[PDB]
Amino acid sequence: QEALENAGRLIDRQLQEDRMYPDLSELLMVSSGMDMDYPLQLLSVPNLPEISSIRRVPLPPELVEQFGHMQCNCMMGVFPPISRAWLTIDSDIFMWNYEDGGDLAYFDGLSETILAVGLVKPKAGIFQPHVRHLLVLATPVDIVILGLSYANLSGGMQLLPDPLSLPTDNTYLLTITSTDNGRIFLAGKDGCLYEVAYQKINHSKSSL
Amino acid sequence: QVDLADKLLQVASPFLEPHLVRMAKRYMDLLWRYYEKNRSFSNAARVLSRLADMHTEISLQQRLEYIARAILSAEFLHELEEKMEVARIQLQIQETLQRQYSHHSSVQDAVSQLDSELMDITKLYGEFADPFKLAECKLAIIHCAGYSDPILVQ
């Protein structure tokens, strides 16, 4: 009867309804055929278009310039948490601010070609558990682990070597991934699987 | 075209005055230009009055700002003041319309009508006050009209 209690009840009921909403995927939904609202044309779905392209940012020429000479190998990617993009040409690696572009960081640490890079979470309990993210970089010879963080003063990017080197000469580490246990699994061009533990040692999961 | 129009105020040329006058009826910019142009109070006021009275859509808030400006520059006065009074009434009626819950948003048309122009007193009275039972407004309106009849007033 009281309006206040009444209103609360209405919202709660509605909230419950919102939560109950059907599961996204069900086989029954498109068992016969998929309903599709599919236009080949951009903005063909006028009102409905799910996505729009807000902006395009070119790679800064300053960044590109230090990518000009690359005999052996190129690769690039985006780090999702960082909101930064990375470029690898041979031995060197660049990280550049998505929002800025002027702001770029460069790794001079690596001596050799960089096979792969990856962003991973730190382990539950190591000396660097605190850091938000870790940057794993694998070259032919070694795997290096560094820490990424944001300066609170400048708001710049801080990279510190967490001197941890893992010899992985034979591996030719193709891929790296992690479980948010903090465990890192990587594969070389040596079959299916291997796992690294920082606490350097490599241990093959799939048995040697 | 250049939107150099502000510069126009500056131009001294004797040709300019007739230019503004002829063009006077995005002419509104010309007129915003014109009343501003007239250093003289009388001439300026006459224009803003016409500005308010004008048939192009201009919000009442502006219509009133014109009057507020025109009045400040104070038979022309006679027309201006009556105008201010009637305009004010519409503002009141307009305000009440928002509060009133008898109204439908889609019948926005009424507001458009209200902001759009000054209206006949009878029109305001018969059309708005009675149907929307705004007794207060009706009373105020009859004040301006100066309708004496005690029975009707009572």
Partner: protein, 257 residues
């Protein structure tokens, strides 16, 4: 004097009592020794009693009387002081906003960091606002704005060009963004009288820091474009309200070089 006047009561009876009261009232007035006679500074903890208060009673009515008189004379400070004792918190801030508001608009070279109307401003805010604040929200809001503008002053000059822009933008008075300069027009007339007056310096402070900071640099990411667009929006703003301003669009002088 108070000690002697107090003896008057020694003759117990009305008449004499009023004579005593009148005498004290007369003493407060024209001696104008308010702090000594009436009291002083809250730091919460109500009044610190004046000599008369130690004797006590009719003290509130005398204060109103004195304070109103202060208003006639225009002895601001005394009025503020008196109203504090009166405990008319809202009144205090309002008088206060006026005092700080003017003295803000003017010409520069002032404001040591230690004593005056600004300092007075700081005292009251810290003082009242935390504690069960009886003042109107509106009144307090203008108060904070005036303080923010003042801190902007402290840092304006004494270097710290970059910091000044940041704070001015925070004020949310002046269009930093796009051509939203006009919205700044719409919200301008609305502005309270105290602020409406202050804007002149807000502009030109902006075009200054904006100028000096954007001194064309020597010999890389240099986004000169911003802190440039800001001047532009500001000028459109200034262009729109010059009539409703003192009459110094000599922003232009600083604007160019």
């Amino acid at each position: 004097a108070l000690q002697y006047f107090y003896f008057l009561r020694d003759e117990k009876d009305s008449q004499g009592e009023n004579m005593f009261l009148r005498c004290v009232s007369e003493l407060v007035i024209e001696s104008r020794e308010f702090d000594m006679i009436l009291g002083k500074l809250e730091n919460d903890g109500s009044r610190k009693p004046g000599v008369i208060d130690k004797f006590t009673s009719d003290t509130k009515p005398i204060i109103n009387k004195v304070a109103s008189v202060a208003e006639n004379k225009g002895l601001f400070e005394e009025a503020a002081k008196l109203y504090d004792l009166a405990k008319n918190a809202d009144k205090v801030l309002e008088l206060m906003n006026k005092l700080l508001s003017p003295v803000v608009p003017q010409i520069s070279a002032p404001q040591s960091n230690k004593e005056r109307l600004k300092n007075m401003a700081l005292s009251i805010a810290e003082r009242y606002r935390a504690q069960g604040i009886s003042a109107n929200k509106f009144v307090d809001s203008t108060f904070y704005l005036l303080l923010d503008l003042i801190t902007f002053f402290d840092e304006y000059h004494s270097g710290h060009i970059d910091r000044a822009f940041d704070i001015i933008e925070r004020l949310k008075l002046v269009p930093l963004n796009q051509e939203s300069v006009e919205e700044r027009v719409a919200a301008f007339r609305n502005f309270s009288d105290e602020i409406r007056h202050n804007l002149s310096e807000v502009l030109l402070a902006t075009m200054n820091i904006l100028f000096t900071q954007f001194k064309r640099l020597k010999g890389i990411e240099d986004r000169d474009s911003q802190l440039r667009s800001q001047a532009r929006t500001l000028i459109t703003f200034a262009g729109m309200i010059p009539y409703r301003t003192s009459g110094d669009t000599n922003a232009r002088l600083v604007q160019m070089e």
